[PDB]
Swiss-Prot record, chains A, B:
Induction comment: By heat shock. Part of the clpP-clpX operon, clpX can be expressed individually from its own promoter.
Highest rank taxon of the organism: Bacteria
Disruption phenotype: Delayed and decreased induction of the extracytoplasmic-stress response.
Binding site for Zn(2+): C3, C6, C25, C28
Native organism: Escherichia coli (strain K12)
Protein's UniProt name: ATP-dependent Clp protease ATP-binding subunit ClpX
């Protein structure tokens, strides 16, 4: 199991969410959050 | 353009992010955030 956004595996990250087919880890969610909130 | 997670269109949401092929809107990012932070 790997993150469909950054490729990291189930082990390399804290949590891995299940999507329609994809996989989003906690790191990419934090990132998408910054992207959307337009903040760093 | 639609959100690969909730199907809403480019117009129905505030922002639409571009992924490797998918599209994640602000609403689904907030959701994924709750899922990961395990909070409501
Ligand atoms: Zn990731
Ligand atoms: Zn969505």
């Amino acid at each position: 199991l790997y993150c469909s956004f950054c490729g990291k595996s189930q082990h390399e990250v804290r949590k891995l969410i299940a999507g329609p087919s994809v996989y989003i880890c906690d790191e990419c969610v934090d990132l998408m959050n910054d992207i959307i909130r337009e903040e760093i």
